[PDB]
């Protein structure tokens, strides 16, 4: 059942393109609100691995995020994960993370945001 659900969701997070982008520079203060701009100006989704991490980096930090780390591979950084996190993971591994997390439909993007 939460098997169903992973293996549809990362059958089809698996085939969505990464965008082609070379040429992007997306100011940005926490690295959520970068995600929240590029899931916006590219109409594009990120894998509950990706959201999770970010997160995770924005935590760690607890100065202008982006005067550290410039947009540009900021962004090229977020892409890059976002291509293992769907190329690479088994929906069993998905199903196991999130039988283990309550709060996990919080890091899937909505369909319709
Ligand atoms: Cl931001």
Redesign the pocket.
């Known amino acids: 059942s939460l098997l169903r659900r992973a293996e549809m969701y990362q059958d089809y997070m698996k085939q969505v393109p990464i965008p082609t982008n070379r040429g992007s520079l997306i100011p ?3 690295w959520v ?2 995600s929240i ?1 590029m899931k916006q100006l590219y109409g594009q989704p990120l894998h509950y691995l990706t959201n999770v991490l970010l997160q995770r980096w924005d935590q760690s930090r607890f100065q202008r995020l982006d005067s550290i780390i410039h947009p540009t591979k900021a962004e090229a950084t977020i892409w890059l994960v976002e291509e293992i996190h769907r190329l690479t993971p088994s929906h069993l591994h998905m199903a196991l993370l999130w039988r283990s997390d309550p709060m996990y439909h919080s890091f899937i993007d909505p369909i319709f945001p």
Do not use: D
């Open positions: 940005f203060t926490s609100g970068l701009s």
